[PDB]
Design a protein around this ligand. Structure first.
Ligand SMILES: [Mg+2]
Ligand SMILES: [Mg+2]
Ligand SMILES: [Mg+2]
Ligand SMILES: [Mg+2]
Ligand SMILES: [Mg+2]
Ligand SMILES: [Mg+2]
Ligand SMILES: [Mg+2]
Ligand SMILES: [Mg+2]
Ligand SMILES: [Mg+2]
Ligand SMILES: [Mg+2]
Ligand SMILES: [Mg+2]
Ligand SMILES: [Mg+2]
Ligand SMILES: [Zn+2]
Lengths: 129, 140, 36, 134, 48, 98
RNA sequence: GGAUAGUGGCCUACCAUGGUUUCAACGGGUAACGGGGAAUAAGGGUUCGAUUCCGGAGAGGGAGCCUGAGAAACGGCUACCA
RNA sequence: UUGUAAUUGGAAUGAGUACAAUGUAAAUACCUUAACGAGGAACAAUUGGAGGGCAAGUCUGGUGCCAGCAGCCGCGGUCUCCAAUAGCGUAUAUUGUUGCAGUUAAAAAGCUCGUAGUUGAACUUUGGGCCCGGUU
RNA sequence: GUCGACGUACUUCAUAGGAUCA
């Protein structure tokens, strides 16, 4: 049974990038998925994406430009303190400034650098690099 | 003149270290930063150096090794020119150390390590376990 | 009987002070470098 | 799934599963059950006392042979008979029948060497710094 | 012709099953700090 | 009973004492400076390792950090005072170059 | 209600049948006094802590007391066990 | 221009001894200091390891004169190097949360149901227009 | 009783492959 829709979306995006497809279909959609994709969009790893409404959970179509090396979800969503962020960046990213660790903090879903600037913390959703 | 028996009395901080092609793979595999990992291992500023042979060697690798190619082109990593036709990096790396005794060799190939070992006064850096290790460097 | 040193090997006087021993070793090493 | 629970509230299952499995190690099992000294040559001690029964290689023609340096000793703790080495035949003169000898870990099959005889170090005797009390 | 060997299913007791083959459950009777037991046991043996 | 008095070891054995290059380096050092034994060289190496580890840890801290500023300034002042570090090289990077 | 400096099944009389437990009770083992701390480790961890400070308990083993603000005291007392 | 000195010159000093003073409750010691205190500076540094060579000598074996073991012992007669260094040697002891593996060489239960336990689709204020004061 | 099963502790057998040269 479906446990994490975000995991399914990120896996579909990774597979589509691997195969060289220029665009991918993600089903079902969600607010968390849309915010994650918006973070990736802000950092340029993905292009334009369009949400299709069918009176159900919904669907998404994402344009891919081939700039994405990897995107993943960290399940379970561990509670991350401000001190503990650097540990996660060391563990998940191939280098220090290569990629981003995305957190759902009390101020929204954001990359770890924005979290450090805003001095917030929360749970960890995944990473993109 | 730079060598006292087997002790090199010229290599002093900050160190100039040649990056081998395979060194980047295991640096990525072990999630070890190039610039800081060398800083931790030696407790000194390190100037990584990438030659044309290794750089051409990386580009031939393919799309799979794009990350290594991106790291190799980081602005902090200086580039070393080559005045030789052959593109084999191992032969190039052995050549440079023979000419001038100031370079650390960062690599993980068993074969290249043995050839450098026969040359006296060449510190030989490698990545193993969780971080970098330096073998023939008394100042450590 | 007093010291009771027993049977011990013959040891060069240079062993009594390490500083002198290392001084001699280093100067000998320099003379060897001049040949290398 | 890697075959392990990953839920955030699954600490108990991870703890209990780990505790049951640590007993698979032989190092852990020996360490907890206090059976790590069964394999030890002296049964947990670093040195053992023994009684010199006979000098087996006393008669061997070739001097300073490996056989010449062996002495058959009876372990006092359990009475089992074992073989022990002597540093050299010169030391073998000091050792004679029916003395207490302190053995330590070391011709294959000989795993013990004599370090003291009659409460005095062999090396002290060999260096002419002490006399064997009788 | 050399047929391939059939690796037999284990009938020798597993490490977790050996602990119950004796009269009692060997796991229950264990010390709290085995590190102290090893250090104390060795010193006592030398004195004995 | 009276309160304990602190003590500490001023030297440590190197990771691999038997490296031939290391042996030659110690020989050269002892001969040049007339050192009595390898203990003195190990002592100076231990002090230098401590200093450089402190400098590296401070460097890991973000610039303008009050701890970095205060401790780095104190360390550089000490090194300059003893004469190891020159006046013009008053930065933590040159502390790692000692 | 009694007793205690005092709350309280702490004990007594009469009443109900309750209380804990697979989120591990109860029973067993402990070379189990607890902590501040020590070592190792890159990090997670693993082990050690009778032992300079804090707190607890004991004065050969059980039991019971006088005095006193304070003791179930033991360099105080009484009995029993050795 | 290298190595070796029971060769040789006169300068230095504390280990120790000791007037004294200081120290201390009184003492010892430390820090001071008259006078003594150095060539084998016998004012006699140690603990381990490696490698030799010597005989009218001893033992063992055999495709002659050799090889192995080894050699404090013979006819008379009463040695070198290496490591640490006021320290050195010997013996015993010293599982994956991050992150393990399960076709063919550890380990997937014969199968299904099922309680506890762990886990469990999406959705409910989003966006827009201004003002204020901060850093770089 | 040179007894059976189990537990424990050990011992042992399975290492060469390619290239060149004679
Ligand atoms: Mg999967
Ligand atoms: Mg009642
Ligand atoms: Mg304890
Ligand atoms: Mg107890
Ligand atoms: Mg305690
Ligand atoms: Mg009491
Ligand atoms: Mg008593
Ligand atoms: Mg009492
Ligand atoms: Mg008493
Ligand atoms: Mg008392
Ligand atoms: Mg259920
Ligand atoms: Mg949900
Ligand atoms: Zn080149």
């Amino acid at each position: 049974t479906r446990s994490s829709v975000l995991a399914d979306a990120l896996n579909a995006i990774n597979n589509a990038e691997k195969t060289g497809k220029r665009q991918v279909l993600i089903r079902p959609s969600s607010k968390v998925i849309i915010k994650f994709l918006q973070v990736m969009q802000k950092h340029g790893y993905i292009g334009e994406f369009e949400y299709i409404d069918d009176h159900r959970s919904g669907k998404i179509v994402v344009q891919l430009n081939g700039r994405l090396n990897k995107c993943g979800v960290i399940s379970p969503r561990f509670n991350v303190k401000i001190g503990d962020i650097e540990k996660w960046t060391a563990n998940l990213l191939p280098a220090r400034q290569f990629g981003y660790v995305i957190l759902t903090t009390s101020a929204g879903i954001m990359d770890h650098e924005e979290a450090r600037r805003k001095h917030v913390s929360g749970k960890i959703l995944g990473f993109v690099y | 003149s730079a060598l006292f028996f087997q002790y090199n009395q010229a290599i002093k901080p900050p160190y100039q270290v040649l990056i081998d092609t395979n060194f980047i793979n295991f640096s990525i595999q072990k999630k070890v930063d190039i610039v800081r990992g060398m800083m931790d291992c030696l407790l000194a500023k390190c100037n990584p150096l990438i030659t044309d042979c290794v750089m051409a060697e990386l580009e031939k690798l393919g799309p799979k090794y794009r990350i290594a190619l991106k790291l190799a082109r980081d602005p902090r990593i200086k580039r070393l020119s080559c005045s030789h036709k052959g593109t084999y990096a191992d032969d190039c790396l052995v050549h440079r150390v023979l000419q001038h005794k100031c370079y650390i060799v960062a690599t993980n190939d068993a074969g290249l390590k043995q050839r450098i070992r026969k040359i006296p006064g060449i510190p030989l850096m490698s990545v193993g376990g969780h971080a970098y290790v330096i073998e023939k460097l008394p100042d450590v | 009987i007093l010291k009771n040193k027993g049977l011990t090997p013959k040891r060069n006087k240079d062993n009594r002070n390490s500083r002198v021993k290392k001084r001699k070793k280093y100067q000998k090493a320099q003379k060897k470098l001049k040949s290398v | 799934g890697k075959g392990k629970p990953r839920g955030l509230n699954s600490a108990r299952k991870l703890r209990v599963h780990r505790r049951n499995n640590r007993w698979a190690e032989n190092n852990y099992k020996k360490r907890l059950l206090g059976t790590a000294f069964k394999s030890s040559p002296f049964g947990g001690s670093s040195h053992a006392k023994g009684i010199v029964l006979e000098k087996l290689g006393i008669e061997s023609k070739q001097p300073n042979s490996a056989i010449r340096k062996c002495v058959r000793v009876q372990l006092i703790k359990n009475g089992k008979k074992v073989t022990a080495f002597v540093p050299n035949d010169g030391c073998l003169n000091f050792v004679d029948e029916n003395d207490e000898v302190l053995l330590a870990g070391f011709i294959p099959g000989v795993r013990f060497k004599v370090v003291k005889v009659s409460g005095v170090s062999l090396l002290a005797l060999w260096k002419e710094k002490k006399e064997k009390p009788r | 012709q050399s047929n391939k060997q059939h690796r037999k299913a284990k009938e020798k007791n597993t490490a977790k099953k050996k602990l119950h083959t004796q009269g009692h459950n060997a796991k229950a009777f264990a010390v709290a700090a085995p590190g102290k037991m090893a250090r104390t046991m060795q010193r006592s043996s030398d004195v004995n | 009973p009276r309160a304990p008095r602190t003590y500490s070891k001023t030297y440590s054995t190197p990771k691999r004492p038997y490296e031939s290059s290391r042996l030659d380096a110690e020989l050269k050092l002892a001969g040049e400076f007339g050192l009595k034994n390898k203990k003195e060289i190990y002592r100076i190496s231990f002090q230098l390792s401590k200093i450089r580890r402190a400098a590296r840890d401070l460097l890991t801290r973000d610039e303008k950090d009050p701890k970095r500023l205060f401790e780095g300034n104190a360390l550089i002042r000490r090194l300059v005072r003893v004469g190891v570090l020159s006046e013009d090289k008053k930065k933590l990077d040159y502390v790692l170059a000692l």
